């Protein structure tokens, strides 16, 4: 058997993450001061007799600074009051901020709040074009709409064209904020990534900044970063000890990039165990992917798929030596999960992740069959197979394992493929398909998404990519609707699914595959979140 030649770039990080020794004197000093600053900030939130505009701005600033996870109760109480008082008598800036903050927190505020800013045709009044702070907040709001919000159909186009026009003459750091916003909206960004930018590039440079909030945000970011580096060091040692870098050299070595994905799903300290479990799964399923895509023969892949369905160490002998390596590591990993969840009495929930893993591998094997046979399915059949091979049903299920408050009922809801999950999966599928079309096309893949779409509808590549872009827009509207109260499960279990969709948008920005090619997209983010501290 002549296997194909290896083409993936090596890990660009070497061993720089493998050892991190926390300085306990500094961590304890930071924690002590943060406790003091946390209370000052709580009192700012609970202050009586604030005007609406000032209250919304305080909440928005605390959220962008990345410290709102300390004040979930206080912020919820305030927005719930604002929602029920239903105030509709403010300028564009305050109205658009009100709309976005309420919708992001699940309060279904009516979009009729914008009618006073439009003419008889439902088009925004052009006289608003000189109000830059109003336009910026309208721009950010336009990204949180559902299918019931067609009154906002024009908001993105209107605000974009006039912010573009105004930007070159704005003072700093407003100019940098507007420019950044036009490249990456707040609602679809990765929270730690957006926070790092706002703290260092914008708030640190505002003349009017609150010194208490800024010091709090810097110390908190840097203290959480120490924990993230300990976790990554622990995961790096785990990866090193497995040594797939030398025994399975055909596969991508990307454990740092996998950790960035897990950090995007949740960053808070209470999800430390969940992050470490999630990153080990992403790493391991990535090995399996490479095995199907660029090494194993048709016959070997059939054996691998059947052995996964049986999930039994007795099956290893049916497999080639190199496949024995990964099969045993997979079975071991889930045994580790069961043991790790044992003192909390939650060992039994591991089977949910295992069943989603079997589904991914079955569909990998179908994808391989289609390739060898030269089959181009209709779009409906393509999607019935290819949605699972995003791995996103599996990752969402895995993200719940280390969450102590997740119950059997939560897994039951997820297992039925609810709408919000189906939407996040669709976004991953169609964005990856648009980004990777030309590459896979040169490698002879006749069953690529854009290809199936062109043959099915009988349209051009350009038209097919546009149809896929519409599918993604429909899916974002479905995610936004899925966050609205009453929710079918706690909001705690919805945010990971939203954050999986945000990771798609950030990774394939400017239409390029960032995970296989971390140099352009992901490398700057990894440096800013895991190498460089914020200077105080």
UniProtKB/Swiss-Prot annotation:
The Asp-Asp-Xaa-Xaa-Asp/Glu (DDXXD/E) motif is important for the catalytic activity, presumably through binding to Mg(2+). It catalyses: (2E,6E)-farnesyl diphosphate = (+)-5-epi-aristolochene + diphosphate; (2Z,6E)-farnesyl diphosphate = (+)-2-epi-prezizaene + diphosphate; (2Z,6E)-farnesyl diphosphate = (-)-alpha-cedrene + diphosphate; (2Z,6E)-farnesyl diphosphate = (-)-beta-curcumene + diphosphate. GO terms for molecular function: 5-epi-aristolochene synthase activity; magnesium ion binding; terpene synthase activity. It comes from Nicotiana tabacum. Mg(2+) 1 binds at residues 289, 293. Self-alkylated at Tyr-508 in the presence of (2Z,6E)-farnesyl diphosphate ((Z,E)-FPP). Self-alkylated at Asp-432 at warm temperature (42 degrees Celsius) in the presence of (2E,6E)-farnesyl diphosphate ((E,E)-FPP). Mg(2+) 2 binds at residues 289, 293. Mg(2+) 3 binds at residues 432-433, 436, 440. It is an enzyme of class 4 (lyase). Changing residue 261 to C/E/F: Catalyzes the conversion of (2E,6E)-farnesyl diphosphate to beta-farnesene instead of (+)-5-epi-aristolochene and triggers self-alkyation of D-432 and Y-508 leading to enzyme inactivation. InterPro entries: Isoprenoid_synthase_dom_sf, Terpene_cyclase_plant_C1, Terpene_synth_N, Terpene_synth_N_sf, Terpene_synthase-like, Terpene_synthase_metal-bd, Terpenoid_cyclase/PrenylTrfase. Pfam families: Terpene_synth, Terpene_synth_C. Changing residue 394 to L: Relaxed product specificity leading to equal amounts production of 5-epi-aristolochene, 4-epi-eremophilene and premnaspirodiene with cis,trans-farnesyl diphosphate as substrate. This is 5-epi-aristolochene synthase. Monomer. One of its GO terms (biological process) is diterpenoid biosynthetic process.
């Amino acid at each position: 058997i002549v296997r194909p030649v290896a083409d993936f770039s090596p890990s660009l990080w070497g061993d720089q993450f493998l050892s991190f020794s926390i300085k306990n004197q500094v961590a304890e000093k930071y924690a002590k001061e943060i406790e003091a600053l946390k209370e000052q900030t709580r009192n700012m939130l609970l202050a009586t007799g604030m005007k609406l505009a000032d209250t919304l701005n305080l909440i928005d600033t605390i959220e962008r600074l990345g410290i709102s996870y300390h004040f979930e109760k206080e912020i919820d109480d305030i927005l719930d009051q604002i929602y029920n008082q239903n105030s509709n008598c403010n300028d564009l800036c305050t109205s658009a901020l009100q709309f976005r903050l309420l919708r992001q927190h699940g309060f279904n505020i009516s979009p009729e709040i914008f009618s006073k800013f439009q003419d008889e045709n439902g088009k925004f009044k052009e006289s608003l074009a000189s109000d830059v702070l109003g336009l910026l907040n309208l721009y950010e709001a336009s990204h949180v709409r559902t299918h019931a919000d067609d009154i906002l159909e024009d908001a993105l186009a209107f605000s974009t064209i006039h912010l573009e026009s105004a930007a070159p003459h704005l003072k700093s750091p407003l100019r940098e904020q507007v420019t950044h916003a036009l490249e990456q909206c707040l609602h679809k960004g990765v929270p730690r990534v957006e926070t790092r930018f706002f703290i260092s590039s914008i708030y640190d440079k505002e003349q009017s900044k609150n010194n208490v909030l800024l010091r709090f945000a810097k110390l908190d970011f840097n203290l959480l970063q120490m924990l993230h580096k300990q976790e990554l060091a622990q995961v790096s040692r785990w990866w090193k000890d497995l040594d797939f870098v030398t025994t399975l050299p055909y596969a991508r070595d990307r454990v740092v990039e996998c950790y960035f994905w897990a950090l995007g799903v949740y960053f808070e300290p209470q999800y430390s165990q969940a992050r470490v479990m999630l990153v080990k799964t992403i790493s391991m399923i990535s090995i399996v992917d490479d095995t199907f895509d660029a090494y194993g023969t048709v016959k070997e892949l059939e054996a691998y798929t059947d052995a996964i369905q049986r999930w039994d160490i007795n099956e290893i002998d049916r497999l080639p030596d190199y496949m024995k390596i990964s099969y045993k590591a997979i079975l071991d990993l889930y045994k580790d999960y069961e043991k790790e969840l044992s003192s909390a009495g939650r060992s039994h929930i591991v089977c949910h992740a295992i069943e989603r893993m079997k589904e991914v591998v079955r569909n990998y094997n179908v994808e391989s069959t289609w390739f060898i046979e030269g089959y181009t399915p209709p779009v409906s059949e393509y999607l019935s197979n290819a949605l699972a091979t995003t791995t996103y049903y599996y990752l969402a299920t895995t993200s719940y394992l280390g969450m102590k408050s997740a119950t059997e009922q939560d897994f039951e809801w997820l297992s039925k493929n609810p709408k919000i999950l189906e939407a996040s999966v669709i976004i991953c599928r169609v964005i990856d398909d648009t980004a990777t079309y030309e590459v896979e096309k040169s490698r002879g893949q006749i069953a690529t998404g854009i290809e199936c779409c062109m043959r099915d509808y009988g349209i051009s590549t350009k038209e097919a990519m546009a149809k896929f872009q519409n599918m993604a827009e429909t899916a974002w509207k479905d995610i936004n609707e899925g966050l609205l109260r009453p929710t079918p499960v706690s909001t705690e279990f919805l945010t990971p699914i939203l954050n999986l969709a945000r990771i798609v948008e950030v990774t394939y920005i400017h239409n390029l595959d960032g995970y296989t090619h971390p140099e352009k997209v992901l490398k700057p983010h990894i440096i800013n979140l895991l190498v460089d501290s914020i200077k105080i």
